[PDB]
C-alpha cells in the first residue's frame, strides 16, 4: 500500500516492536572495521541481492516525505544530524533518496 497505514498495521509492530527498523539489520563485510560507504543498491533489474537492507527487503514499506514517523527514527531526536548509511545499514541509493525525501 502506497499510504503509510502499513506502519500502524500490527504486523509491523510484531515484526519490529518499539525498536527502530535499522536496529535488527547487520552487515556482512570484511574483518574489523567495515567499509566507509555502503553498497550501491540492494535491488538490480528487479532482482534483490542477498542480505539486503531492511527498507529494501520490506517492499511493502514506501519511503516518502509523508511517512514522518518512519523517517524520523533515523535522524536522532536529540541531535538534528541524520545518521550515516554505514550506521543505519542501508545502501547509498535509498539512503540519499531518504535524505532528499526528508529534506
Amino acid at each position: 500500500d502506497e499510504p503509510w497505514k502499513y506502519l500502524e498495521s500490527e504486523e509491523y509492530q510484531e515484526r519490529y516492536g518499539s525498536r527502530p527498523v535499522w536496529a535488527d539489520y547487520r552487515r556482512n563485510h570484511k574483518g574489523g572495521v567495515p567499509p566507509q560507504r555502503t553498497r550501491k543498491t540492494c535491488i538490480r533489474r528487479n532482482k534483490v541481492v542477498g542480505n539486503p537492507c531492511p527498507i529494501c527487503r520490506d517492499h511493502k514499506l514506501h519511503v516518502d516525505f509523508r511517512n514522518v514517523k518512519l523517517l524520523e527514527q533515523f535522524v536522532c531526536a536529540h541531535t538534528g544530524i541524520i545518521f550515516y548509511a554505514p550506521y543505519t545499514g542501508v545502501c547509498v541509493k535509498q539512503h540519499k533518496r531518504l535524505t532528499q525525501a526528508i529534506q
Binding site: 535499522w22 552487515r27 572495521v33 567495515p34 566507509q36 536522532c76 536529540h78 544530524i81 550515516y84 545499514g89
Partner: protein, 343 residues
C-alpha cells in the same frame, strides 16, 4: 549367520569409534563424524516384504463389531507402503541434518558477542530472567600431568547485567565448554558489582586509570553519540544500561584485567550528590543546547558551606598529550574518525 549376528549398540560403537586411540590426545580426525541413527523406533513392527494384514498389531483388531481375518497386501499396495516409508525416512534424515544458526557476535567462529540467556533458577528458588549474559572470551588452556600428559581445560570469561546499573564479571574453568559456561554464569550471577550512572546513559565524569599495565581512559559524552569503545566495553555497557560514552585502552590488551579495572573505576567514581554533600557547595550544570543557564544537579543534604571555593589557577594536574593533541587539532590520523557500524 544369525548366530553371528548380534545387538545394535555394539555395531554402533564399532562404527563410531568413540574412543581408544583417536579420541584421546585431542588428535581426533579430519572433521568426519558418523551421526547416530535409531532404526528400531522408526518403522512399525508389522512392516515387512510380505504385507500380510495383521489384526493384532498392524490393523485394528475389531471393525464394525466384527472379528478380522488374515489378508494380503498386494503388489502395488506394498509398493505404495514402501514409497511412503522411503519418503518418511528421507523426511527424518532431512530434519536430522540441517543448519545451525547461532547469532554472529563479534565474529564468526568466535564466542565474543554470544549470550547464554539469563542464569538458571536457584535451588531454593531464585529467578534471574532480568539478567542477560555475555561471553567475553574463551580459551583452550593446557596443563600437563604425569600419566595422561597434556589436558585441555576450557577457561571462559563472562559478564551478566540487568541494564539498570547492576552487573558482574566472572571466570569459569572446566573440562567441558557447556559446563564451564554454566559454572561461570552461576557464580557470575552470584558475584555482582553495582555502579551508579548520571542520567541513565552516561558515567558521572571521565575516568583514567591503570591496572596491570593496562591503561584505560573513559570519557563522558552527551546524548546522540553512541558507544565508541572496545567491543568488550560495548557489550558490558549494553548489559549495564548506559547508551553512550567514549573510551580508549593503551598498553597491554588482556580483557580480564580490562574488565576488572573497568568495574573498579566505575565503582570508585563519585556521584554528584556524594560530592556535593562532601564539599558543601551547589553543583551547577551547563549544556551547549541550553544557553548560559545554571542547571543545579544536586545540593548538599547537610548544612551548606558559607564561603565559596577560592579560584584555583594554573593547577598542578597531569594531563594527556594525546587528548591535548586532539583538542589543539594538529593531530591527524585516518584511523581516528571512522564511520563504523551502529554503536
Amino acid at each position: 549367520s544369525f548366530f553371528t549376528k548380534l545387538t545394535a549398540d555394539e555395531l554402533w560403537k564399532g562404527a563410531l569409534a568413540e574412543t581408544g586411540a583417536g579420541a584421546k590426545k585431542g588428535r581426533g580426525k579430519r572433521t568426519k563424524k558418523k551421526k547416530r541413527k535409531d532404526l528400531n523406533r522408526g518403522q512399525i513392527i508389522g512392516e515387512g516384504r510380505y504385507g500380510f494384514l495383521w489384526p493384532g498389531l498392524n490393523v485394528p483388531l475389531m471393525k464394525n463389531g466384527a472379528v478380522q481375518t488374515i489378508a494380503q497386501r498386494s503388489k502395488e499396495e506394498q509398493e505404495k507402503v514402501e514409497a511412503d516409508m522411503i519418503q518418511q525416512r528421507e523426511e527424518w534424515d532431512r530434519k536430522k541434518k540441517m543448519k545451525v544458526k547461532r547469532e554472529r557476535g563479534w565474529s564468526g567462529n568466535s564466542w565474543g558477542g554470544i549470550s547464554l540467556g539469563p542464569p538458571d533458577p536457584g535451588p531454593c528458588g531464585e529467578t534471574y530472567e532480568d539478567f542477560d549474559t555475555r561471553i567475553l572470551e574463551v580459551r583452550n588452556v593446557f596443563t600437563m600431568t604425569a600419566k595422561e600428559g597434556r589436558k585441555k581445560s576450557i577457561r571462559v570469561l563472562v559478564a551478566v547485567g540487568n541494564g539498570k546499573g547492576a552487573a558482574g564479571f566472572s571466570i569459569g574453568k572446566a573440562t567441558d565448554r557447556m559446563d564451564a559456561f554454566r559454572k561461570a554464569k552461576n557464580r557470575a550471577v552470584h558475584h555482582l558489582h553495582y555502579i551508579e550512572r548520571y542520567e541513565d546513559h552516561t558515567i558521572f565524569h571521565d575516568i583514567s586509570l591503570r591496572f596491570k599495565r593496562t591503561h584505560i581512559k573513559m570519557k563522558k559524552q552527551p546524548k546522540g553519540y553512541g558507544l565508541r569503545c572496545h567491543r568488550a566495553i560495548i557489550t558490558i555497557c549494553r548489559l549495564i544500561g548506559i547508551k553512550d560514552m567514549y573510551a580508549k585502552v593503551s598498553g597491554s590488551i588482556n580483557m580480564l584485567s580490562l574488565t576488572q579495572g573497568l568495574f573498579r573505576g566505575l565503582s570508585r567514581q563519585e556521584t554528584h550528590q556524594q560530592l556535593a554533600d562532601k564539599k558543601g557547595l551547589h553543583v551547577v550544570e551547563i549544556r551547549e543546547e541550553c544557553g548560559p543557564l545554571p542547571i543545579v544537579v544536586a545540593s548538599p543534604r547537610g548544612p551548606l558551606r558559607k564561603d565559596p571555593e577560592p579560584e584555583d589557577e594554573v593547577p598542578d594536574v597531569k594531563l594527556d598529550w594525546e587528548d591535548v593533541k586532539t583538542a589543539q587539532g594538529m593531530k591527524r590520523s585516518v584511523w581516528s574518525n571512522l564511520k563504523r557500524a551502529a554503536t
